[PDB]
Amino acid sequence: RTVARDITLLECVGKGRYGEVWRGSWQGENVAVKIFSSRDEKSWFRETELYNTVMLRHENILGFIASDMTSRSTQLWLITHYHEMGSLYDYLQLTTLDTVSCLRIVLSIASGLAHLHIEIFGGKPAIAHRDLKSKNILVKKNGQCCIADLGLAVMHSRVGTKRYMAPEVLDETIQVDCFDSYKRVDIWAFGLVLWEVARRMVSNGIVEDYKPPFYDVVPNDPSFEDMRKVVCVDQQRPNIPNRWFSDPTLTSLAKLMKECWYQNPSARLTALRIKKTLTKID
Template sequence: MKRVGSVSFPCNLFKNALNQMGHRGVVLFLLLQSLQALAEDGQLMCVCEDSGCLDSRQCEGSQCYSSVKVGGRGVVVTRGCLQGSEKSRMTCFTPATLSQAVLCCSSFMCNRNATADSLLPLLTTAPKEESVKYRMETLALFVLGPVVVLALLSVLSVLGCRKLHRGRLQEYDPEQGAIDGLIISNVGDSTLADLLGHSCTSGSGSGLPFLVQRTVARQIGLIECVGKGRYGEVWRGQWQGENVAVKIFSSRDEKSWFRETEIYNTVLLRHDNILGFMASDMTSRNSSTQLWLITHYHDNGSLYDYLQRVPVETGEGLAMATSVACGLVHLHTEIFGTEGKPAIAHRDLKSKNILVTKELRCCIADLGLAVTHSQANNQLDMGNNPKVGTKRYMAPEVLDETIQTDCFDSYKRVDIWAFGLVLWEIGRRTYSNGIVEEYKPPFYDQVPNDPSFEDMRKVVCVEQQRPFIPNRWFSDPTLSALVKLMKECWYQNPSARLTALRIKKTLDKIHSSLEKGKES
C-alpha cells in the first residue's frame, strides 16, 4: 500500500488498470508517481548511465528517469537522476515522440530494470496536435490535484476489472509475430473499409488514427512471406479475416521506414493510384526490434512480377500506364487547404514499386526515399535517408551528379525518366498483331544483371543509349504513340521532359483514339 497525503490506495491494482488504457494510462501513472515524490522528503538513489554520470554508476535526485531514443545510432537507453521538482515536472511530462520517450519514477533505484524492450512501446507516431492535447490534459490533472486523480483512478479500476472479466489477453506469439485476441473498443468488429472510410477526418494523414494503428498492428497474424529484398521482407497477413500486406524493414533500412511512416502520418495521400496505408508500428519479435509498415494487400503483386507472368492486351497495358501516371500526378501536385498536401517526388519509381490491383490498375508504393516541397515556405524536405534510388532506373543527371539538389523540379524530372522506363516495360508485354516480347528489365542487353553505378553512367550518360524499341511497335498505332511518349520522358536535358500532368493527358488521348478505332 502506498500513501499520498492521508489517502491510501492499492497501487498495483491501479497500475494494472492503467496499463489497459494505453497512452493515457501511462500519463496518469506518471502523474501518480510524481505526486508520490512530492509527498516524500529527501533524495532518491538512482541508477546513472548518462554522459553526465562520469565514473559513478549511481546518483541522487528528486526523481529517477530512464529514456529511449531511436536515431542514427540505433536504439539508445539512458538512465539517471532529476534535480528539483520543476525540472522533474518539465522532463517527466514531455510527450513521447516517434524517436524519443522518457519514463520517470520515485522510489529507490526504480530505474534499474529499464531496458529498450520496456521503453520502446512508449514511442508514438501521434501528430503534434495530439501531443499538445495530452500536455494540456496532464497540466489540468496536475493542477486539480490528488482528489481528481483518485477519482479517475477509481473509474479506471472499475473499467479495468470489467475488461479483465471479459477475458485476459493472450501472450505474444513469437512465431506469428502478433498478439491474438486483443480487443479495443476503438476497433471492435470493424472492417478495413469501415476504418479507412473515416480516416480522412482522423488527423492522421491517409492512415488510421494513431491509437487504432497500434491496435491493428498488434492484431495481425503473419501468414506467408510473399517477397524479399535488400529492404527486408513483405508478408501476407490477416486482420479480422482480411488480407493485409506487412512490410518488415531490415535494421539497415530503418531510415526508409521512418521516412515512409512520417510522410503517411502527416500527408493526406488517399488516392486510388497510391498504395493504401493502414498502420506503422515498432514491434518486438524474438528479442529484437522489428519495423512494420502495414498496407492494403494486392494478390497480383508488383507490376514487375505481373508482367513476367502475364502479357497484356493493348487496352489493359494502356490502362495500367494511365493509372501509374494518375498516381504520379497526385504525388507531384501540391494541394492547398486544411486537408491539403505538399508536392512529393518519389525518387525510386520502378516496376517493383508499383502494385497491380484486381481491376488490373496500378498503385504506386514505397515512399521511403520521397522528398516533399511546400510553396508556402519554399521548404524542400529531403528526410534523413542517404540512399539515392535504384541504379538501373537512375536519370542521367543523377548518374553524372549534375542534378540540382536544391531544386524540387529536378526530383520530379527524375521520376519522369523512370516512368518512361516503366512505360517501355509495359510496351514489351503488350500484344500487337498477336506478337509480344518476353519480359526484360530496362537496358537488359546493355548492362549486367546487377549493374554498378559506373555501368549505368557509361551507357546512359557517355553513350546516351536508350532501351531498344522493337520494329513491330511502329506498325501498331497505340504502341507507336507510346514510343513517342516514352522518348519525350528520356531527354538528356531534364527540363525538356514532359510533366506528369502532360503525360496523363497524352495517355487519355491515346486511349480515346483506341476506343474510336474499336468502334469504327
Template sequence: MTSEIPRKGLLMLLVALGLTKGGVVKASKDQLVNCTCENPHCKKPTCQGAWCTVVLVREQGGHPQVHRGCGNMNPELCLGRPTEFVHHHCCYRSFCNHNVSLVLEEPDVDPPLLLILGPVLALLVLVALGALGLWRVRRRQEKQRGLHSDLGESSLILKASEQGDSMLGDLLDSDCTTGSGSGLPFLVQRTVARQVALVECVGKGRYGEVWRGSWHGESVAVKIFSSRDEQSWFRETEIYNTVLLRHDNILGFIASDMTSRNSSTQLWLITHFHEHGSLYDFLQRQPLEPQLALRLAVSAACGLAHLHVEIFGTQGKPAIAHRDLKSRNVLVKSDLQCCIADLGLAVMHSQGSDYLDIGNNPRVGTKRYMAPEVLDEQIRTDCFESYKWTDVWAFGLVLWEIARRTIINGIVEDYKPPFYDMVPNDPSFDDMKKVVCTDQQTPTIPNRLAADPVLSGLAQMMRECWYPNPSARLTALRIKKTLQKLSHHPEKPKVTH
C-alpha cells in the same frame, strides 16, 4: 506534507527537457536520434533530438502522466533522482524511450495521519468501486452504439472481433483519422498492428521482407524493414501520417508500428494487400493486350501526377517526388489498375514556404532507373523540380517494360528489365553511367509498336521522357492527360492466360 508539483513548475520542467515547443535547440544532424513522441505538443508520433526522454509527472490535483519526447538542452536534469512528484529518464539510442516505464516514489505519511485517513480512504474505495461499475456499464453501452473508445480506438475493431465482420474498409473510411494525414490515430495503428497475424512471405529484398498478413480474416500487406533501412520506415511513416495521400493509384496505408519480437525490434508498415503483386511480377507472368497495357500505364501515370502536384487548402498536400520509381515499386490491383508504393526516399515541397524536405535517408535510388543527371552527379539537389524530372525519366522506363510485353499481331517478347542488353544483371553505378551518360543510350523501342496507334503513342511518350535535358521532359500531368486521350476504346481489358 508537500503539495504536488504546480502547473507552472511542470511547464518549466517540460521545457527544460525539450517536451514543448519552447524547449527545442538545434543539434547537428549526425548527433540526432529518433524518439517516440507522446505528449500534448507532439505533431507526429516521432521526433528528433539529441536524446530521448520519458517524464512521469504528478500535476497539482491530478494523476501521474507520462510524457515521451526529445531532449535538446540541459542534460543534467536527466541525472535527478525520482521524487513523489517527478521522475525523468534519458537515453541516447533511437526509440529507446518507447517502452520505458517509470514509478514515482511513495510520499512519507505520519502514522497519526494514517489513522485519520483510514476510514476516509475506505469510503473513497467503496465510492470508486461503485463508479467503476457504473463506468463499465456505460462503456459497454457505448460499444454497442458504435462510439469511439477513450483511447480513440474505433469501435469498428471491437465489432469486427465480436461479429467476424469485414471492417477494414469501414475503419479506414470512417472519420477516425488524425486530421493531419491519411493515417488512423497512432494508438489505433498500434492496436491494428498487434492484431495482425503473419501468414506467408511474398517478397524479400535488400529493404527487408513483405508478408501477407491477416487482420480479422482480411488480407493486409506487412512490410518488415531491415535494421539498416530504418530511415525508410521512418520516412514512410512520417509521410503517410502527415500528408493526405488517399488516392486510388497510391498504395493504401493502414498502420505503422515499431514492436519488439523475438528479442529484436521490428519495424512494420501495414498497407492494403494486392494479390497480383508488383508490376514487375505481373509482367513476368502476363502478356498484355494493348488496352490492358494502356490501363496499367494510365493508372500509374495518375498516381505519379497525384504525387507531383501540390494541392492547396485544408484537404491539400505538398508536392512529392518519389525518387525510386520502378516496376517493383508499382503494384497491380485486382481491378488491373496500378498503384505506386515505397515512399522511403520521397522528397516534399511546399510553394508557400518554399521549403524542400529531403528527409534524412542515406539510401540512394535503383541504379538501373537513374536519370543521366543523377549518374553524372549534375542534379541540382536544392531544386525540387530536379527530383520530379528524375521520376519522369524512370516512368519512361516503366512504360518501356509495359510496351515490350504487349501483344501486337500475335507477337510478344519475354519480360526484360531496361538496359538488359547493355549492362550486367546487377549493374554498378559506373556501368550505368557509361551506358546512359557517356554513350547516351536509351532502351531499344520495338519496331512493332508502330503497327498499333495506341502503342505508337506510347513509344513517342517514352522518347519524350528520356530527353537528356531534364527540363525538356514531359510533366507527369501531361503524361496522364495524353494517355487518357489514347484510352478511348470502350472494351474492358482482360487478363489472358
C-alpha cells in the same frame, strides 16, 4: 474498448535487403506487412514521417493502414492494403496485354505519379518518389496499378535503384536544391516502366519477352559506372522494336517514352501532360 492489434503473418511474398513483406490477416482481412531490416530503418522513418504529414489517399497509391514500432532491438512494420496479383514486375513476366489493358496500366501509374507530384493548397505537399520501378508498382484486380514504397520520397511546399537512375543522377549534375529536379528523375523512371509494359502488349500476333530496362547493355546488378557509361557517356536509350510502328497505340507510346528520356531534364514531359496524352490514345 478492445484495440485489436494482432496480425497473423501467413506467407512471405517478398525478401530483400529492405527486409521482408508478408501477407497477413487482421480481423479476417488481408493486409501486407513490411518488416524492415536494421539496414533500412530510415525508409520506415521517412514513409512514416510523410504519412504523419499528409494522409495520402488515392486509388493509384498503395493504401496506408499503419506504422508500428515495437520494443524487443526495435521492430519496424509498415502495414498496407494487400494486392494479391503482386507487383507489375511479377505480373509482366508471364502475362501479355491487349491495348485496353496496357493503356489502363500505364494511365493508372501516371495518375498515381501526378497525384504525388502536385501540390494541393488548403491539401498536400508536392512529393517526388525517387525509386519508381516495376517492382514498386502493384497490380489491382480491377486492372489499375498503385505506386508503392515512399521510403526515399521527398516533400516540397539509400539511393534509387541504379538501373532506373536518370542521367543527371549518374553524372551528379542534378540540381539537389531544386524540387522540380526530383520530379524529372521520376519521369525518366516512368518512361522506363512504360517501355517495360509496352513490350508485353500484343500487336499483329507479336510480343516481346519481359526484359528489364538496359538488359542488353549492362550486367545484372549493374554498377553506378556501368549505368553512367550507357546513359551519360554513350547516351543510349531502350530499343523501340520495328513491330511497334505497325500499331497506333505502341507508336504513340514510343513517342511518349522518348519525351520522358531527354538528356535535358527540363525538356521531359510532366506527369500531368503524360496523363493527357494517354487519355487521347485510342
